[PDB]
Structure formats: structure tokens, C-alpha cells
Design an enzyme around this catalytic site. Sequence first.
Site, PDB file in Angstrom:
ATOM      1  N   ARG A 189      -2.378  14.296 -27.568  1.00 59.62           N
ATOM      2  CA  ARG A 189      -1.167  13.657 -26.517  1.00 59.62           C
ATOM      3  C   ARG A 189      -1.735  13.322 -25.347  1.00 59.62           C
ATOM      4  N   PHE A 211      -0.927  20.991 -21.846  1.00 57.94           N
ATOM      5  CA  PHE A 211      -1.175  20.632 -20.798  1.00 57.94           C
ATOM      6  C   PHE A 211      -2.395  20.413 -19.832  1.00 57.94           C
ATOM      7  N   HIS A 240       8.348  24.122 -17.817  1.00 58.43           N
ATOM      8  CA  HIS A 240       7.173  23.854 -18.325  1.00 58.43           C
ATOM      9  C   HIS A 240       6.456  25.153 -17.590  1.00 58.43           C
ATOM     10  N   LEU A 250       8.541  18.365 -13.925  1.00 57.55           N
ATOM     11  CA  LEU A 250       8.473  19.324 -14.736  1.00 57.55           C
ATOM     12  C   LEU A 250       8.493  20.785 -14.557  1.00 57.55           C
ATOM     13  N   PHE A 284      -0.490  11.080 -16.276  1.00 56.15           N
ATOM     14  CA  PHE A 284       0.641  11.942 -16.519  1.00 56.15           C
ATOM     15  C   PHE A 284      -0.542  13.120 -16.680  1.00 56.15           C
ATOM     16  N   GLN A 298      -2.580  16.583 -23.265  1.00 54.86           N
ATOM     17  CA  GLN A 298      -2.218  17.353 -24.127  1.00 54.86           C
ATOM     18  C   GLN A 298      -2.682  18.476 -24.823  1.00 54.86           C
ATOM     19  N   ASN A 323       6.351  22.234 -24.649  1.00 54.80           N
ATOM     20  CA  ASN A 323       7.310  23.372 -25.417  1.00 54.80           C
ATOM     21  C   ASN A 323       8.618  22.433 -25.901  1.00 54.80           C
TER      22      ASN A 323
END
Lengths: 165, 162, 78, 80, 104, 232, 438, 52
Positions: free
Chosen positions: F133, F187, F200, F196, F138, F141, F180
Site C-alpha cells: 500500500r 509504514f 500509531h 496519526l 503520505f 506500508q 495497526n
Amino acid sequence: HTIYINNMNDKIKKEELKRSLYALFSQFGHVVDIVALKTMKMRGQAFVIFKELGSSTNALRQLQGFPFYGKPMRIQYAKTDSDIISKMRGPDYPPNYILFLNNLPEETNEMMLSMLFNQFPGFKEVRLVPGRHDIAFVEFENDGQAGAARDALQGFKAMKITYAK
Amino acid sequence: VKLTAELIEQAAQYTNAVRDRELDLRGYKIPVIENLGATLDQFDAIDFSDNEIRKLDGFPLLRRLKTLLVNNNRICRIGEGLDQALPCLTELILTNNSLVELGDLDPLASLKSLTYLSILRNPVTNKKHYRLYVIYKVPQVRVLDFQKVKLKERQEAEKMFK
Amino acid sequence: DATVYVGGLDEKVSEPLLWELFLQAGPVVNTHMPKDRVTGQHQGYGFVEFLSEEDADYAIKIMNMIKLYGKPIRVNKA
Amino acid sequence: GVPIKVLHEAEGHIVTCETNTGEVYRGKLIEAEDNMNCQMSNITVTYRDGRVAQLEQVYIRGSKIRFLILPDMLKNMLKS
Amino acid sequence: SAFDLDVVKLTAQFVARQFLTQLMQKEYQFDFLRPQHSLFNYFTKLVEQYTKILIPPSKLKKREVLDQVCYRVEWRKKEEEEKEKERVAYAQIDWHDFVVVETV
Amino acid sequence: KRVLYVGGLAEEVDDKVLHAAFIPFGDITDIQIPLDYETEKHRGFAFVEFELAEDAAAAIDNMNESELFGRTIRVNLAKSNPQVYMDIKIGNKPAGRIQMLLRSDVVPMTAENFRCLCTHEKGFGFKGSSFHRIIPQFMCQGGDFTNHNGTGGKSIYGKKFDDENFILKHTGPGLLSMANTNGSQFFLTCDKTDWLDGKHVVFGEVTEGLDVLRQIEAQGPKQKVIIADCGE
Amino acid sequence: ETILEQQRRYHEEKERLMDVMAKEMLTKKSTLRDQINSDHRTRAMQDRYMEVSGNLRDLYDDKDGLRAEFYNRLKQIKEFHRKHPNEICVPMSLKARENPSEEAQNLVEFTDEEGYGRYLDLHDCINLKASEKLDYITYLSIFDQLFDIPKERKNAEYKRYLEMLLEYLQDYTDRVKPLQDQNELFFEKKWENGTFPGWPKETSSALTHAGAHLDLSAFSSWEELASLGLDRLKSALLALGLGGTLEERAQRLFSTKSLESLDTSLFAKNPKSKGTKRDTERNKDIAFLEAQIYEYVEILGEQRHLTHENVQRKQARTGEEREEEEEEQISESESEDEENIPYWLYKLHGLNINYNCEICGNYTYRGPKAFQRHFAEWRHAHGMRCLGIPNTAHFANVTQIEDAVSLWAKLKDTEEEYEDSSGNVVNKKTYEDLKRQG
Amino acid sequence: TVAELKQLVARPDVVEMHDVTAQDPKLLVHLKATRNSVPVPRHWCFKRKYLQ
RNA sequence: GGAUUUUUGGAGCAGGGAGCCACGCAUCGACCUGGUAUUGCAGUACCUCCAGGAACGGUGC
């Protein structure tokens, strides 16, 4: 929750008796209230009420015959529930005097449970002895004493003792 | 779990069985007595039973405090300026603590109103002459370990230690 | 949080596979997926109103795992 | 009266009361009537000799009150 | 950890004043004595500290405290930023707009 | 910063020769020499991993352009807090090495998990897995080495472990953070991702190879992005 | 108890405190600077930093952000220094134990709370970052020390004293500004050009109250300076000089008897006379208080001026202006020290009709369709489920909290045959227990 | 009371808003929950005349 | 708009004397020494009795 004490030196003034009683019994848990009168009927006696039941049982076993103002006090579980307890809180055989259950092993034994049950004048039936050493059948002359023993070890870190309800 | 004004402010507060205003500090695992200022001198006595306090010390000036229940802690020493912060201390219950030497009980001589004292279940209890020592060094006590201090004991404590 | 913004979509997707798609997680009470009139096609970004907020915050947590036409789907609070 | 409204505001708070005879009662104000009649609970009383006592429940007639001390929580009726 | 703490601090108390080097041979509890065991380091601290208490065993009669705390006070971000700018521009210029002169 | 590239190796040079030539600078944990099985000979280069980064640094300074078996060799970085690496392949093409510092001082359990997943010392890990991903501006991952789609992975402790703390924040690109319910998925940030924060666990940072991370981001996947090799 | 450990812990705590107030002095140098500057004008010897440092608010190279908070932290540091002084005081005043340390071996406890609980007990900053105050002084509040008109030391409120003063002079010819003009008198003017006769009762009483105020204000606004030091300094100046400290080349030596004296000789032989004994024995406290008012007002010249200015400003305001200004002072006072049409349609459809749900915040609903939609909702189910009443249709009717409790109470045994043929009443688990017993 | 009426039924969920206004709820409670019977259609109390 | 919780009053009055120390009268209460009675499951003006002690406390004149 309430213990009945008798054989107390009745020469102590009422307010001093109650304050020493409070002090002495605070070591086992919060004492909610103390009822003691000097009438002919009630002199030499007192009812000590605790928030926690385990506290009452511990007090009973540890202070049995403790010299207080010169005399050895005699402690017992009260016959009835204290008015204060009934108000703070809100079957026909209960309270029962035969507690059978298990969950009390670990080299535990019959002379062990017989002396622990012996502590009580109610010491009548004691069944703890097979390879088990973990099934306890206790018949205590009366529920004040069965309740005293049961309230004394009411959480034998958890054993299971079930009145013959 | 430090003693705190925040701790003290949420603590059960009530009129006890002997008709006194009492603060319930029991069972918090307090190690050191501190920040009592926040009670604002509004209590007759404080219940500090079942905690981990080592020394009976650290009190602010508290004029209304008359009863201190300090059962099942680890008291091994008594502070020296206690009368200066607790002038009317009348009852002190120290059952089941760690006082070991007769000399460690010496600071209680300065509590002029101390009348009810309980030191049971402390090693110091088994020391030779423990009772007579307390009677001579803390004569203001009238009831010691729930037994009346009698004249004959006072005289006997006057001989020994005279 | 009751609503979410959803980016990066392909016009063969419509309001129905969003309906079906996000109710797989939890029910979309109000769906909004613009139809552009001029060229008659979708840009692919979405707004979702739920029953209450808890639905939509769990939706923030779980929600951005959807992949529309092999491709990534943006879901954030609003 | 304006003071009376402020008194009713102190219901549920700890207050101190001195009587006409100088006994000093400290505890929780349960009810305050218009005429200053005061119901309180869990009291500490300090007599003229200095001695203290403890009471669960009391009620004092308004006329026989000399004064009351209220929290400072109230101080913040500035219109008048 | 109260046990470990207590033994470290005790052996540190005595070690602060030959008794430990004898104890080790006389009696796996004191495994922190070797610099191998991590805790050993903290040990070296405690002892030092106790060694210090032995220093002025003299009263401390310390305005001054304030002055001191000021002096202690007296005793990077921008750079990071500039660097960032540089990275941006370096990454963002035409390395194909060549116009050379000579060679070495 | 513990792994070095060593090039210009004569045919007679092998792992034994390399061990002997580099051990004077410090203990060595691994030596890899790619081979051509058709010839049975190496391709002229190798990777030497030192136990300590400081020792790897001293080796670079004294061995780069030095002589070994008659010819000049080339030595440089291939790509207390652990440092780990991932060699990245994009499509069929090597992209380079990302080097990462793991913040064991702040999040020891989280750092240790990622470290072990780089070395495979617990019997499983990241080697050969993908970045499944990738969203430009951004994050990238990866770490789903069981299902390869964001639904799998496992930690060295079991399926999942607690969020240790949220001390480290998502302040900019090149940060490592747990996807998670922590398992193995993680990531690498490609911008400040502060939304985030507190959700995270951030646990490390890129120290070398930000450019390789940007190549991954460029695929945000349009082409497969694979962890061709990894380690400490 | 090994004294070594106690003394150790003491030195350690002292270290911790020094480190705390040093960290503070670090983040905002003003804390020290401010303080030090004032100190400069009380104890002349004091060395003060380079002006540049003060202005740029820097200690070495980095200029820190300019910061109610300054004062706050100053009082916090005040209590810290108190703790420190106490510890310093008490401080000024092996196998056997290691064996007993073996006591209670079996405890599953992590112990990371000695230096962390202290370090923490004295550090900056709530959950994360809301209140600058340390746990040590978490109930420290400046508003209980400063009034709103004082603005944490910016001004001193003298209006009250202007009132009392009007009451003292028995007239109204005196304005706030003329009163301040009077205060200005306070090394010789307040003595030789008194507003009133210095033997007047009302006057001396007033002066007492005012003096007390000024002094408390002084030390209140400068926590960081040693109060006792200042007090003693002033007292010694009073005793040793204030000895014919006022001298005139013409009239000689003045005595605070309110008379002059030709030479020092007659002055000395007058300090034993019955007159001076009487006076110094009656008016001592007043004279001393006057003196304090004098020196403390001198130390606060900047605040006095600042306030007088304020007065003139507010005075020259309009209504709206004065109001907005007051608003500002108020906000500064109560602010955190650290910042983070279809009419018949709605009747027909049944909406905009008053209704209430009891279980939800005694909430109001304007429509029956809407309230019927409340039954399936996030908050409604939160009230149910968090209340202990599980969320299902069953309950999708009644609103009041009570009835659904009895409804939920309405919502929410084998025989293993012992060998004596009596155990047909005996439970499974019971007979298994008799398996363990058998 | 619509409250206590919900204690008299095996499946009290069947009781609804207008159900408490029934001329004989003490029965309809027992009918509507009958084993295999089916519910009444819902298009009434909607004034829309069953379709759009 | 002077009749019980406020503004038309229940107020008024009484202490020095003797050589720092001590104090008339009346009422009530614990209270302190001895000794002695009771062994009773309660929610309380107080609580056995007998003899001795009060340089005790409160209230009024």
C-alpha cells in the site's frame, strides 16, 4: 458484620469504653458504629459493627480472650443483623450451621480443620481427611459459631464452603 | 501513591461512631505523611491504617486533630516536633508497626495532652520494662495498651529510672 | 465523525457499491457520491453520514482498508 | 432579601453558624428557610468554654442565629 | 525491584567505607559486582554518592541558590531547517542544463 | 550504518580473505558474496556487516581505495539503538538501500520486534515481502509477510502487542511507524502525518536512503516493490 | 536506619530542586532577570547580567520567547526554595540489614518510582500539556494573592485607600489624583510637609493600614527575593541611622518628637529625656511603619508611576473605552497561565411538536417520527448499553430509565446419580467433587 | 402503563407505540405473538397511500 | 406596617479582700480511691451497691 462482646469490665465509663473499643477494633477494618449501654441488662457488653464482613471475622478470631481493661473479652457473632447494616443494604434456613464444600487442599488436614473448627465451641462435625484433604464438611453446633468459623476464614485464598442450605 | 490534596479531597469524610469528624485515608499505600494543609484543620482525627508510612512526622499545624489511628503501617520512628504541630493530640493508636527501641518512643513525652496510647504488636513491647519505661517517660498517658495506668505502676517506675 | 470524505475512485463505482461497500463495515445512513452533470461522470470522492459518531470513529480506524478498482480509497473524519 | 438568596445558594455546602449564645456549629447546610431557620448535618460544635462535640443532625431557629460563615466559592449577585 | 535496589545500595554503603571482596569469596546475588552486569554502572553511581556524603561530614549554609541555578542554566533547529531547504532545491533543479568549459 | 559495500575484489578473494582483512577494525557479524552459479565465481563485490557502526566507519576510512590481492578496492556504506537495512527492488530493478535507526531507548519492545523481523533470527521476517500500500505524499506500508495485503503479519511476541507509548510523533518524512494491535506491518512516512499522532507508534527513522524511499513513493502499487534483502 | 542513606536522599532531592528551578530559569530567563533587577536596587552590590541579554531574553546564544506566568513560576520557585531550605536544615542537623532485606522475597512488583516520582514531582507541566504548574504546587493560585486591579504586580490598587482617606480628612476636596500626589511625598517631605498632623489618630491609623498594604504588595510581587534579608536590612537602617539621619545645615537634627535640635550634643542628651522616652515609647510602631511605607514605596517607584499613569488614562477614557479596557483587565485576570416556513407541513408530518425522552439527558424531541428514530441511534444505545440494559429491539419503546431496568431483570441443573442411589438429586459438579474425594 | 404491560408477554417487543391505546391490549399482546401468524403491513401511519 | 424569625427591647444590675498565690451561697454533673454486685445478643436523658475524696467543671445572685 456485627460482633457481640461480653465479659467486659463494666467500671469503665460508657464514652471511654466506646472510644477504646473503636481504637482497638480499627486495626481490622472500618468500624461503622458501636452500641453499648450500662443498663443492668446490657452492662459489660457491646456490639461492634464493621463495614466489611471479613473484618468482623478477623477481629473475632484474633481478639478472642484479649485482656481489655483487666478482663479477657469473649467475642461472638451477633444473633441478628444490626439496624444500621439493614439500612445500608436496602430463603428460610439461612443462617445455616453446616458448611460443606471444597476448594481447601494443600496438605490441609482433619486435625488442622478440626483445630480451626475447634476454635469454635460449636465444633461438632469435621470431615476433611481422604486422599482429598480438600472436601470440608463442618457441622457447627450453631450458625453463630459456624458463621464465626466461616467468617474467620471466609476467603481462604478461593476455598468453597457451602452451608447445608 | 503520594499523599495529596487531590487525594485528600476525594477521600471519604464522615462523622464517626464516637461522634468526631474523621477523614478516611486508609489503604492507599501512602509511604510519607505530607500535604495535610489541604484538610484545612477540619478533622478531629485521621485514619491512616493499612498504609506504608515509616515515620510519624510531616504534619502542618493542626489544632483540631485529636485522634490518630495508625494501625498496620511501618512506623519505626517518631518525629521530634509533634507537639508544635499537634497540640491537642489526645489519642494515638500505633498497633502493629515497627518501633523497636524504648528510646524511639521518647518523642511522645512532648505531647502534653496525650492520654490514650496504644503500641501493641510492636517489637518494643517485648523489651524488658517496656511498660514502666513508657509510664515514667510519658506520664501524661492514662490508658496504655487498653489497660489503666495505675498508681502502683507509677511508683514502681519512679524507683527504676528515678 | 458521523461523515467521512473518501478519495481516489473509478466511475464504474457508484453510490451502490459505496452503500454495499461501507455497510460491510457499518451501515451508511446517508450516502453522497456526486454525479457530475456536464460530462456525466464521477470524480470519485465521497461523504458519508452515519447513525451516530461511534460508528464513524470505528470507521476511521477500520475504514481505510477499502481498495476501489485495484486502487486506494481515502477515508477521513468530517 | 438579597442576602437570603445567597444563603439558599450555600445549601449543600459546609458552613459555620454562631448562635445568640455563642455556640459555634460547623457542618453541611441541608436546608435554609426564608426566616434563616437552618437544618445541618455532621456537625462539629465548639462551646463557649472551648470544648468540642460531634452531632449527626441539627436544626437552628433563624432568630437565635447571630451569623453564618459561608464558603468563598459563592463570592464571585455582583449586580446589586 | 526493591530487593535488587536494597542489595545494590547496601553493598554500596559498605563498599563506600575490603568487606565486599571478602564477602564474595566467603558466601549469584552480588553478580552486579562485575562491570559485566549492567546494574554495575548504577552501583558505581551510588557508591560515589555515598563517598560524597563522607566528604563534608561540615554544614551547608547556602540569593546564592538562585545565582547557582542561573549559572547551571547558562552551562540546531534552524540548521535542520536550512538543510531541509537545500535538499528541496537540490532535488528540484535541472541537472541536465549543462554548459561545460574544460576537464581534468 | 553497519553494512558496507566492498567492490573491486580479485577472483582469489573469498569470505575468509574478507574476514581477515576487515576484522582488525572490529567484530563482524556477516559476510555475503553474490555468486554466479554458472561460473561458480563471485561477481567482484560483497557486503560486510560490522557489529558496531563506529567500527564500520573506521573500516571505510582506512580500507576505501586500499589494496587487496594486488588491486584497489572500493568501500562505502551499502545503504544502544539498533540500525537495520532493507535493500529494495522495484519491478525487476534494484533501487538501493534504506538504512533505519530503531528507537529502542523510547520503544524497546517495538524496536526489538522490527529488528528481529529484519534479521529473521526468530525464524521469519521481512525478506522477500512487499510494500503493498503506497500513497504519494503520505506513506509506504509493508510488513505483511503472510497475506501481502494488509490483513496479515505477526510479531515476535505473538499475533499482536500493545502500543508502548506515543512519545515519538509523525513530524516529517522518513519516519518508521506501526500499522495497526501491533504485529509486523509498518509504514515509512512521506510527509508530516500528524493526524496519526497518538494512533500509531512511531519507532524509528531513515538515516540513509531517503532517495530510495522516494522511489518507492513514486510507485504509489504501480509496480511491485520488494524487500530483496534486509538485516542489521 | 543508616543515616548515610537519608543524607544521600537529601543531597539528591536538593540536586533535583536546583535542577528544576534551573530548567525554569532556562526556558524563560526573564524569571531570573526580572528578579535580579529588583534585587539590584535593594542590595546595591549585586552584579547583574549584560543589558543585551536581558532585552533579547537570552542567557547565552539562544533568545527565548517572551512570556501572569512569570509571576506564577516565581511563586512556584518560591515554594521550591522553601523545600530546599528545609531539607538543607534537617541535613545539617551492613550484613545485619542486608539479611533483613531478604524479607518478603515473593513480591511481583516493578519499582521505578524513587527518582522518577521526584523528578516528576518537581517538573514543568495535566495529562500531557495543559498546566505549567508542577505536581508539587498543583494547587497554587495567584488570583488568591493578587486582586484584578493589581494585574499580578502591574498596578497597585489605591482607590480603596483614597476612600479611607476621604473618611480621614472629613471632606471631599481630595481627588484620586490629588491623593496620589499626597502619596508621592513618601526622604524628608513625608516628614516635614505632612498631609495631616503626624500626631493625628485617624491619620496614624490610615498610615499603618497603607504601609502594611504596600509592604505585602512588595514581597508579593517579588517572591524570588529573600524577604527576611530585606526586612532585616530595613530594620537595621532604621535603628542605626534613622540616630539623627535627617540633618539640616540650618536647624540641625530632626527627630521622627517632630522637633529639630541645634547640635548633635543637645540631640543626644534629648534622647534620654522624659519627653523623648514617652514619645519613642508610644509612637514607636507608627514611626517604624511610616518608615517602611517610605522605603517600600521607594523600591516600588516604577509600579507607583505605572499605576498613576493607568489612573490618568482610564480617567481620560470615554464610556465604551473604559468598558473595553476593564474587559481586558478581566480577561488577563481569569486566563490560564499557559495557553494550549412549512407551517401546516410540520403539523401534518407531525414535527415541531414538543416531546421528551427521559433516558437521554431528559432530551427534547420536536417530532414523533424523529423520536421513533431515536430508538435506533448511537447515543440512545450508549445510554442503554452503558446503563447495563443491552441494545436490542425488545426495549425499543419505553423512555424512562426505571422501567427498562425491571424489563432487563425480566430478560436476565443435572443429576449425576451417586452410588448409594440417593445421588439422583446430586449435581454433576458435586459428584465430580466426590470423584476427587473418592 | 406501556411500561408494565411489557412484563406480561413472552415477546414484549411486539408491543409498539400505538399498541398501548388498544381497546384490548391484554389480548392483542397474546395474539400478535402467536406462533406462525404474520405481522400487519406497515404502510399505514404513513400517509403516502402505500406507494410512490 | 409595637403580639414568637430581625426596626418600637428580656432588659437591668452585682466582685473586691487577705498574705505572684488563695477565695461566699444554692442547684446539677460527671469524677477520683478502695471494696463489692451482675455474665446479661443491643440501637441509649444516666445507669450496681457500700465507704471515703473533691486545692473539679458549668449556671444564677
